[PDB]
Amino acid sequence: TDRVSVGNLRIARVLYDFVNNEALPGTDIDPDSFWAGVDKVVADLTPQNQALLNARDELQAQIDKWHRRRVIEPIDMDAYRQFLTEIGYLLPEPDDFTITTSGVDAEITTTAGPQLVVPVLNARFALNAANARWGSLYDALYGTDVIPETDGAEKGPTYNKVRGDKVIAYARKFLDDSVPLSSGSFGDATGFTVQDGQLVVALPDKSTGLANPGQFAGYTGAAESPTSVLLINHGLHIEILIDPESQVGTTDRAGVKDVILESAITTIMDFEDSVAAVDAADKVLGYRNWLGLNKGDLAARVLNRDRNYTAPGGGQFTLPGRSLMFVRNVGHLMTNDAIVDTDGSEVFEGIMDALFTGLIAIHGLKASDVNGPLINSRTGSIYIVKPKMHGPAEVAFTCELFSRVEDVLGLPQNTMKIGIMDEERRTTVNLKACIKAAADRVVFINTGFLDRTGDEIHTSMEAGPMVRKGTMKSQPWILAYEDHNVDAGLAAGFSGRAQVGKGMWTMTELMADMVETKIAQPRAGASTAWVPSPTAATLHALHYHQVDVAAVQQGLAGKRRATIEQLLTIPLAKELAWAPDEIREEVDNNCQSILGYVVRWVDQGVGASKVPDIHDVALMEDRATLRISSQLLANWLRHGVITSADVRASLERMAPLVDRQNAAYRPMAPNFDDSIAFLAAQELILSGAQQPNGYTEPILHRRRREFKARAAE
Ligand SMILES: Cc1c(C(=O)/C=C(\O)C(=O)O)ccc2[nH]ccc12
Ligand SMILES: [Mg+2]
């Protein structure tokens, strides 16, 4: 009726045409054999994929039952650990080994810096993300609360000089700290020149060079009156733009216009938790954006070209003007009716994504005929982040999938590299084996701490009531999880070979707090960590200039700072831990968060957006935070902390508040049960305990499809 038959598969026409007319041409893959391959791969790997999913359920049932047959609330760690081993949850750790992944770009093996993650369905965000390799420090400081909006220094309709001066001073201090002068301060600079290949900085009473002249990387314009000077520190570039006749330069002692930081070294184009894609139409819109990015012709605004510099000696060179791109595929769980078989059964979306995003990525290995000749991966790798994997057999399966896809695409084996999200408990406690199962493909491990927290709650759902959502970030289990991740990577030889990454900062308006606190991540040895915007990427870059990540990692070598016991420490709430008002606040906090997110997901197909919590702090959250909130209330409901009336009342109380915050928006109040979005939120909480591993996708997908079908009437 609207589907194309290929072997046992019935492919939605919109997807079939997209692949044939847009994805395949230029790849030199015969369409016939591609589609035959899709059918073969799906048929061969579907059974294993299903067996893996059934194994999760069998494990979770056994754990649930272990908790229900015990009364002793002080959990016996010795017996729990033995139980997990018996049932195959906790596997033996393999002998020491080193990863052998090759053909990986410098941005991944060597450079430490921010990693930006954006929804691929939003073409403009995606474009801005790709262009976010360079970002204005002045704009990041002026536009955020990193420079406090104190009296006199508030941002108005026009340039506030008092504020600008604070921005300038902040950046002079950064420069002093990052690329020190031999004597004196950048704050007192009057000019820059290049003399015999050395950077010279004029002070009022003298001239001076850098304390480390090798931090001078280049310049533009005349050496004796440069338009910019390029510095490098800890592998990251810093560009001072010189323009006395500019609106800012005119007020600056050296005529400096801006300081540009190399910011988002790598970007993850997300098909998973930050997007809403429930059918072939949604997937195509995403695939098309991924295609445009890899061909370099995406336009919503266009992709930046490379940056040209003059070397200290006077020669010419270029730096990449774009972030190196990963794509995040969906995980092993969900099916999607973009393709169905002859029984009407939907095909696994993870299998589809590997095939399609892998196909499309081939274009990023060829020179863009357009805004190029930017090759995404010069070293010939395709970078796919695989989320939500549970344990080493699931990693093995992703390997096999990637291997079979490479064959269908005619790519060399191991072309398709894997960024492993460590964001499920069964991966956390078997991490070394997981890395080993991908020892030839792995290019990162990353602590997806939000999903990890969700999995923590669901796995131990039957053990007792959990601590509040805000308490979770500082629990012993999570701190051990974070340290264990770093330790496993380093011991597997990631240093110099693969990224060790940490998680997302979600408080987009609290940039001063981000600058003060997120430095903890590179201090702990992470070579990269996630940010949600180009602005946040520029500000997080500051941290990699303050912290020598390579040195931190080498200082950590051989350390064993987390035990299996610490990892298995369930975040159970203590006896009488909350007063009535604290319980109410937490319920209201979670309900508002769920409703605010779900209404845009279900009604407008938006997978990530800003939602003010119970303190008005605007959070840029995605499905993972929804997973936490819904599981936490499900856990409180399961154990009698709150009643179903408390939840209902809270949802009904927060709903008009969420309608206010969104004032093409259809209001949830007052006809709650006429709102598909309101009912979805309720369902996420009330059925949370019965969702597989607490995953929210089954409900969101069902409800979004219901909504779309209504709008079609
Ligand atoms: C991409 C993302 C995540 C995210 O997916 C993190 C992880 O996968 C995790 O912690 O599990 C969380 C919050 C966000 N806000 C804007 C983008 C965004
Ligand atoms: Mg996640």
Side-chain angles (χ1 to χ4, degrees):
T1 164
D2 54 349
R3 293 191 183 270
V4 187
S5 48
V6 182
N8 199 43
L9 302 186
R10 305 303 180 255
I11 305 166
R13 186 62 193 278
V14 69
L15 174 60
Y16 182 75
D17 291 343
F18 168 80
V19 173
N20 285 335
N21 305 338
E22 301 171 56
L24 284 168
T27 68
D28 309 341
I29 298 161
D30 162 43
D32 223 336
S33 37
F34 172 74
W35 287 115
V38 171
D39 169 78
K40 189 48 166 293
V41 171
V42 172
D44 286 342
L45 301 195
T46 289
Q48 264 181 293
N49 194 329
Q50 185 68 61
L52 289 176
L53 293 180
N54 301 343
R56 301 177 180 182
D57 292 348
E58 121 226 318
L59 287 171
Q60 191 56 70
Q62 288 173 100
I63 294 172
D64 288 341
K65 183 169 57 256
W66 186 96
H67 290 298
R68 289 195 304 260
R69 297 299 170 144
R70 269 179 85 269
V71 35
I72 308 170
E73 193 195 353
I75 156 190
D76 195 277
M77 190 47 59
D78 296 86
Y80 182 65
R81 194 179 162 186
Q82 188 153 331
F83 172 68
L84 295 183
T85 304
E86 292 291 310
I87 68 175
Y89 184 98
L90 186 51
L91 298 180
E93 155 190 345
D95 292 320
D96 282 336
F97 69 95
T98 309
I99 58 174
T100 61
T101 317
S102 66
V104 183
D105 294 89
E107 286 82 344
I108 296 169
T109 62
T110 308
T111 322
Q115 180 166 79
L116 171 58
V117 191
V118 300
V120 78
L121 265 302
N122 187 314
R124 58 155 57 170
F125 287 164
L127 279 178
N128 291 341
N131 291 339
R133 179 73 169 258
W134 303 83
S136 166
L137 182 58
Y138 282 22
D139 292 347
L141 294 178
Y142 194 101
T144 67
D145 72 346
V146 179
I147 308 305
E149 267 189 279
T150 56
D151 203 279
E154 48 276 313
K155 30 176 183 300
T158 59
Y159 186 70
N160 178 347
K161 185 162 185 304
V162 176
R163 182 170 187 76
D165 286 340
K166 287 178 178 198
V167 164
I168 293 168
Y170 192 99
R172 291 307 217 276
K173 177 49 162 55
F174 161 74
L175 289 178
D176 283 338
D177 306 329
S178 303
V179 188
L181 305 179
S182 296
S183 67
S185 160
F186 277 93
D188 297 313
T190 56
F192 303 92
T193 52
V194 180
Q195 192 57 69
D196 294 294
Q198 314 310 129
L199 176 70
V200 180
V201 180
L203 299 185
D205 36 355
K206 60 150 57 180
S207 287
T208 183
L210 305 174
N212 171 14
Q215 292 188 286
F216 178 42
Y219 65 101
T220 62
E224 302 81 8
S225 203
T227 45
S228 70
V229 51
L230 182 68
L231 306 172
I232 187 174
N233 176 58
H234 299 159
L236 295 182
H237 289 97
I238 299 173
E239 185 166 359
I240 304 170
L241 298 196
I242 301 148
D243 193 357
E245 71 194 329
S246 70
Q247 168 266 321
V248 172
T250 200
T251 74
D252 185 85
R253 281 202 265 175
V256 166
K257 166 196 187 80
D258 199 342
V259 171
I260 307 313
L261 299 188
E262 201 173 5
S263 301
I265 310 314
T266 59
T267 291
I268 300 174
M269 301 299 169
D270 194 17
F271 281 82
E272 198 221 22
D273 279 354
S274 81
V275 303
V278 304
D279 57 31
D282 295 340
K283 298 296 289 182
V284 169
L285 286 189
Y287 291 149
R288 186 170 291 122
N289 287 343
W290 181 233
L291 178 61
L293 283 160
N294 281 271
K295 293 177 69 161
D297 65 10
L298 186 58
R301 279 222 264 208
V302 293
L303 284 169
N304 284 4
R305 314 278 172 92
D306 280 13
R307 304 176 67 99
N308 302 294
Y309 298 95
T310 300
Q316 298 294 314
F317 73 94
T318 277
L319 296 174
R322 291 183 210 168
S323 211
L324 174 52
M325 300 182 204
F326 293 61
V327 54
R328 181 160 74 166
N329 282 10
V330 308
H332 293 323
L333 176 69
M334 289 300 291
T335 57
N336 190 295
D337 75 333
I339 307 183
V340 302
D341 63 35
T342 55
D343 278 316
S345 308
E346 305 180 354
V347 163
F348 286 113
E349 197 177 357
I351 296 175
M352 273 175 31
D353 275 357
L355 283 156
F356 302 132
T357 71
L359 170 63
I360 293 167
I362 289 176
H363 299 273
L365 306 173
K366 316 182 52 226
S368 318
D369 295 273
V370 205
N371 298 65
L374 201 348
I375 286 191
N376 190 62
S377 173
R378 299 205 60 90
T379 60
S381 285
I382 292 175
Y383 305 113
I384 301 189
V385 183
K386 197 63 178 169
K388 295 180 167 58
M389 293 187 295
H390 296 246
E394 296 195 10
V395 180
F397 173 74
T398 305
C399 196
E400 188 65 26
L401 176 57
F402 282 11
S403 171
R404 291 293 298 270
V405 170
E406 285 161 353
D407 281 321
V408 170
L409 298 176
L411 296 169
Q413 286 293 303
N414 303 323
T415 294
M416 287 171 73
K417 300 296 192 302
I418 181 170
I420 294 173
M421 294 303 305
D422 170 16
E423 65 183 350
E424 311 292 345
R425 196 164 184 258
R426 189 150 58 105
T427 290
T428 295
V429 302
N430 296 294
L431 189 52
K432 185 171 185 190
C434 288
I435 291 164
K436 189 193 171 179
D440 239 88
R441 297 183 178 266
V442 60
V443 293
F444 79 55
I445 62 188
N446 184 289
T447 47
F449 78 104
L450 298 159
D451 267 312
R452 181 59 182 80
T453 300
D455 200 40
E456 185 66 31
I457 296 166
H458 195 76
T459 297
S460 289
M461 174 64 67
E462 300 290 84
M466 300 299 168
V467 293
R468 308 170 69 178
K469 181 177 162 110
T471 313
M472 280 293 177
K473 344 143 166 285
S474 55
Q475 287 281 289
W477 74 264
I478 202 167
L479 304 180
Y481 150 79
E482 292 284 1
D483 292 343
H484 176 64
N485 184 273
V486 170
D487 291 344
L490 296 190
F494 274 39
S495 221
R497 294 187 180 96
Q499 297 177 320
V500 174
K502 293 187 176 312
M504 183 61 86
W505 180 269
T506 60
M507 290 132 295
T508 51
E509 301 181 347
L510 297 182
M511 288 295 99
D513 292 18
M514 187 191 80
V515 168
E516 190 188 25
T517 65
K518 202 172 167 61
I519 192 167
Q521 294 172 332
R523 279 190 174 145
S527 52
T528 201
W530 287 7
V531 294
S533 69
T535 296
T538 299
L539 295 168
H540 185 35
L542 298 173
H543 298 142
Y544 298 85
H545 287 287
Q546 283 135 33
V547 177
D548 192 343
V549 175
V552 170
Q553 294 183 341
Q554 282 174 106
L556 287 182
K559 286 190 179 62
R560 211 81 259 274
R561 297 157 305 142
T563 63
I564 181 62
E565 279 86 23
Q566 291 177 284
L567 293 172
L568 301 177
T569 308
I570 297 169
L572 260 13
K574 296 296 147 68
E575 179 186 24
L576 304 169
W578 320 292
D581 82 279
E582 288 168 320
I583 294 180
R584 230 281 239 281
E585 186 190 9
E586 180 73 16
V587 174
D588 280 342
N589 195 29
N590 284 298
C591 281
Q592 148 99 40
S593 166
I594 292 161
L595 277 175
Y597 182 77
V598 162
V599 72
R600 289 180 202 180
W601 211 100
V602 171
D603 290 6
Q604 302 183 63
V606 180
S609 51
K610 321 201 183 182
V611 168
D613 70 339
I614 202 182
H615 311 302
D616 297 12
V617 174
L619 303 328
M620 252 226 175
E621 60 208 1
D622 77 354
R623 272 207 303 270
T625 61
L626 176 66
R627 185 174 175 206
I628 295 171
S629 300
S630 59
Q631 287 295 294
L632 199 262
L633 294 178
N635 169 264
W636 281 17
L637 200 58
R638 163 67 175 84
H639 289 290
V641 182
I642 56 175
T643 68
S644 51
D646 291 331
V647 171
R648 183 76 198 187
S650 195
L651 290 164
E652 284 180 5
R653 191 159 54 248
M654 303 314 301
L657 219 211
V658 178
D659 295 326
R660 256 172 280 154
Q661 285 163 343
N662 283 260
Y665 175 84
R666 311 187 70 98
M668 282 172 301
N671 311 352
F672 303 108
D673 283 39
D674 269 304
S675 175
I676 298 164
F678 184 92
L679 293 159
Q682 187 179 251
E683 187 170 9
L684 285 156
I685 297 173
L686 299 186
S687 303
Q690 294 296 305
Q691 300 304 299
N693 303 110
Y695 289 136
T696 61
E697 293 93 315
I699 297 176
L700 288 168
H701 281 217
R702 191 161 57 242
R703 292 288 185 179
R704 171 63 172 163
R705 288 175 61 89
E706 176 179 10
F707 183 92
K708 282 168 92 157
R710 298 292 76 71
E713 298 165 339

